[PDB]
Each structure stands twice: as structure tokens, then as C-alpha cells.
Design a protein around this ligand. Structure first.
Ligand SMILES: [Cl-]
Ligand SMILES: [Cl-]
Ligand SMILES: [Cl-]
Length: 163
């Protein structure tokens, strides 16, 4: 575990993370995809061997000794708000299980279902609160990666509010 487990946020490409493992915002089919998934495919393409996994689940595949946790959030274009909310919460609970199993002291995480799976809605708070619910009982240092300037401020504020 980390000596004083923390949450931090950085605005940059998650493929340049300084953590002991990465969470991929994956598709269920283990395809290269777009956005975070494509950056992860270019950096760790070996990790996409047998990475296909259902919505609401996470599947880890090693790239050398570096763990890539493929977490499949729901596409809110297809799911109801109610069923999408349940799958998005579940995906993050499966990430917490994998992070614990791997024994890492740190993890780089994106906000699941906030990009092309958002169904055109702002889900910063929804996705971040499910991340916190899952990760608060882990002792890994969590570093959240985003790409928007206003989102960096809102994530930072939400971390600081809990102290
Ligand atoms: Cl960058
Ligand atoms: Cl997304
Ligand atoms: Cl963002």
C-alpha cells in the first residue's frame, strides 16, 4: 500500500502516466477504439491479447510486467440512465478488486463513460462519485487523468472538498 493513500488529478495523456498500472476505458470487444482506448493501444498493444470482457467488468492483461486493467463502462446511448448507472458503478468496483489483487502502490485512472460513451451528457460528477465509492477502501495512490481544463478544476475541487 501507499504510506498515506491519496487522490490526485492531472490533465495529460494517461499513456505518459507515472503510476504502477493503468486503467483502460475499454470497449467490450478489446478493439483499439478511439480516445483514451486508442492511446492505450498505441502504448501497450500487447495488453489487447484476449482483453474482450462484458460491460460492467474489468480484465487485466500484462504488457511485459506492467498491468493494463481494461474496464468496460456502459455506452449511455444504449443503456437506460438507471441500468447505465448500475453498470458504471460495477465497472469501478471490478477495477478496485483488480488493483487490490495486483498489489500495486499506485494506479492511473480515467473517468469511465464521460467521452463517446456519455450519450451526450456531462457525467463528471456521476463517474467521479462511482470512482470514489469503489477506490476509497483501497490503499493505492489514485491519479485521475483528464484532458479538459474546466474538468481538471472540478475534479481537483471535488478531491479537496473531502480534504
Ligand atoms: Cl500530453
Ligand atoms: Cl467514454
Ligand atoms: Cl476530460
Amino acid at each position: 500500500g501507499a504510506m498515506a493513500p491519496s487522490y490526485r488529478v492531472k490533465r495529460m495523456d494517461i499513456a505518459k502516466n507515472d503510476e504502477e498500472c493503468v486503467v483502460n476505458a475499454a470497449n467490450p470487444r478489446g478493439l483499439p477504439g478511439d480516445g483514451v482506448c486508442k492511446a492505450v493501444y498505441k502504448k501497450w498493444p500487447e495488453s489487447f491479447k484476449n482483453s474482450a470482457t462484458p460491460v460492467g467488468t474489468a480484465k487485466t492483461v500484462m504488457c511485459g510486467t506492467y498491468p493494463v486493467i481494461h474496464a468496460v463502462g456502459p455506452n449511455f446511448s444504449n443503456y437506460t440512465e438507471s441500468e447505465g448507472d448500475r453498470e458504471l458503478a460495477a465497472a469501478y468496483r471490478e477495477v478496485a478488486k483488480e488493483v487490490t489483487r495486483l498489489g500495486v502502490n499506485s494506479v492511473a485512472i480515467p473517468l469511465l463513460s464521460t467521452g463517446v460513451y456519455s450519450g451526450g451528457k456531462d457525467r463528471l460528477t456521476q463517474s467521479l462519485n462511482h470512482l470514489f465509492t469503489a477506490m476509497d477502501s483501497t490503499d493505492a495512490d489514485v491519479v485521475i487523468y483528464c484532458r479538459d481544463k474546466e474538468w481538471e478544476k472540478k475534479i481537483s475541487e471535488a478531491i479537496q472538498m473531502r480534504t
